[model samples]
Target: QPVGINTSTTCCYRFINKKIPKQRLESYRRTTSSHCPREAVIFKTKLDKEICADPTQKWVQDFMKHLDKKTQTPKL
Candidate 1:
């Protein structure tokens, strides 16, 4: 058996089902299999790596905040 998180490649999957791409999931499996099987929320990190995480996790929450800040437009 393989261990890895599923990745959503399409908008529908990410919005309605919230799924990730199969290939991406496999890649993630090569590194680690820890993930949310039922509902995995995928996030792209600052390093340009995709990861599956629980949205309720503290780290995920922090990451979201970090991403928001990073993507925010500079204020005049």
Candidate 2:
């Protein structure tokens, strides 16, 4: 077994900040900050937002893969 090996089973979710089009405003459930101009989703344990995605999306999946590679690389 490796000393620095990660054994944690905690789950982390990714949140996206996207604009709410006029047509979808009425049905939108998530609230945005007053300081922000457009509607936004709050932090949560899952990607349950209406305009968001899951790990199935290519961009989202690829981003997670890159994160592992980025942190695993040798640093100077």
Candidate 3:
């Protein structure tokens, strides 16, 4: 899907419930699936497509950590 802030005509009616390689992703945003699924996250790809994923899943969680490492710069 194309990148955006919100959708007026579509929603996360399903999920790709699989591990998307961290190397393939560049950014992300988590939100509840509008009028459909419960917890979800949109992984913005290196190709500029935002794809649906369930944040509760193991792989998704792992990917989230990877993203945190990739983005958040908490000097410790």
TM-score of each: 0.33, 0.24, 0.52
lDDT of 3 by residue, 1-76 (tens): 3223443233444665465565577777876555543444577776687767632356666777777875445584
Best first by lDDT, ranked: 3, 1, 2
Instruction: In model 1, state the lDDT of residue 73.
Output: 58
- On a 0 to 100 scale, what is the lDDT of residue 48 in model 1? 55
Q: Estimate the lDDT of model 1.
A: 0.39
Scored by TM-score, the top model is 3
Q: Residue 74 of candidate 1: its Cα lDDT?
A: 47
- Give stretches of model 2 more than 4 Å off: 1-55, 73-76
Residues 24-75 of candidate 2 have per-residue lDDT tens digits of 2222233445542333332212233334332223433343343336334447
Model 1 C-alpha lDDT per residue in residues 16-73, reported as the tens digit of each score: 2144333332222112245324434565534456656532245444544544563445
TM-score of 3: 0.52
Instruction: Report the CA-based lDDT of candidate 2 relative to the real structure.
Output: 0.33
Pairs that collide in candidate 1 are: 3-33, 7-20, 7-21, 8-19, 8-20, 8-21, 13-18
lDDT of each: 0.39, 0.33, 0.59
